[PDB]
Amino acid sequence: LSALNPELVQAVQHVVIGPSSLIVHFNEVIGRGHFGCVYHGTLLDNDGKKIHCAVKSLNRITDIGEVSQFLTEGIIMKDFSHPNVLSLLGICLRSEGSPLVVLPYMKHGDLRNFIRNETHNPTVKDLIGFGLQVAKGMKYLASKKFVHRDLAARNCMLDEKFTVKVADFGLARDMYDKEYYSVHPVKWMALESLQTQKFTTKSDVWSFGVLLWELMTRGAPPYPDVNTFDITVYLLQGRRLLQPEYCPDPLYEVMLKCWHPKAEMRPSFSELVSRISAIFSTF
Numbered sequence: 506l507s508a509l510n511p512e513l514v515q516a517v518q519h520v521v522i523g524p525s526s527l528i529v530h531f532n533e534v535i536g537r538g539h540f541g542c543v544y545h546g547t548l549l550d551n552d553g554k555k556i557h558c559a560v561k562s563l564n565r566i567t568d569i570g571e572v573s574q575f576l577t578e579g580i581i582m583k584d585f586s587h588p589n590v591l592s593l594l595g596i597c598l599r600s601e602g603s604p605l606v607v608l609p610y611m612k613h614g615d616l617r618n619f620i621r622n623e624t625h626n627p628t629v630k631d632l633i634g635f636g637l638q639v640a641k642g643m644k645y646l647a648s649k650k651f652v653h654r655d656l657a658a659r660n661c662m663l664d665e666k667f668t669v670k671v672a673d674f675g676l677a678r679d680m681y682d683k684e685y686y687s688v689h690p691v692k693w694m695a696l697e698s699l700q701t702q703k704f705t706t707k708s709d710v711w712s713f714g715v716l717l718w719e720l721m722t723r724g725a726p727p728y729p730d731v732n733t734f735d736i737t738v739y740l741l742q743g744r745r746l747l748q749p750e751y752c753p754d755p756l757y758e759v760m761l762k763c764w765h766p767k768a769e770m771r772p773s774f775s776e777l778v779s780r781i782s783a784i785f786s787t788f
């Protein structure tokens with residue numbers, strides 16, 4: 506680590522968690538395998554408050570060029586903070602072992618598994634509230650010109666107060682990468698992204714519309730009968746996800762606006778917050 510550029514070391518200092526500030530519980534995983542090797546940890550703040558965190562070791566980082574790029578990603582993501590976006594608590598640069606990413610612990614795991622869980626019974630109002638929270642998190646990301654590229658219910662998380670956090674971006678990416686011993690998002694993508702492999706805030710709006718559909722169906726898979734290959738033709742014919750049984754008509758109108766074939770015709774996330782907040786307030 507002494508081979509690191511000193512001005513970059515100075516720049517990342519405010520993101521770095523010293524080893525005496527963090528107690529990593531490498532003996533216990535969070536999500537019992539659902540998220541791979543993500544560990545419980547305890548972070549000590551400056552007042553000695555104990556903070557429950559999720560810790561991941563980044564084994565793909567093997568050389569000093571990759572460590573330096575990682576430091577930079579930490580610097581950038583530390584400036585992203587919003588009630589509905591997963592925050593970065595910090596990073597660890599270890600003398601012994603791969604670097605660590607430290608995030609806030611999410612008591613209720615991912616939003617898709619939460620809504621699919623038969624034991625949980627969120628109301629239509631609660632489901633719309635989750636959608637509004639995601640819209641607020643994306644309004645924040647879009648306001649900083651950050652394009653998510655993989656928005657879906659599986660990629661959002663829930664804390665102990667049931668606050669939704671948009672996740673799976675920056676150092677929280679690769680949320681479901683699992684390591685196997687012997688084994689080797691087209692249905693959320695905007696039509697133009699399927700065609701050009703380019704992503705924008707307007708393609709995140711399309712994905713948000715599919716996430717809204719997931720919320721109102723309590724986590725049903727979209728287009729279950731359509732092969733991923735055939736999705737482009739299906740959308741070009743003007744076919745779209747149908748209105749879920751318990752979805753209010755003005756909310757389905759919002760979903761349809763998200764899937765307009767012309768990206769410029771789709772609402773902005775600011776407009777989505779405006780429209781969904783008014784719908785939410787009728788319940």
Ligand SMILES: O=c1[nH]ccc2c1ccn2Cc1ccccc1
Nearest residue numbers: 540543559561608609610611677
């Ligand atoms: O309780 C949690 N809080 C925040 C993130 C998170 C969990 C569980 C899995 N994950 C995903 C992830 C963790 C670390 C690094 C990268 C991705």
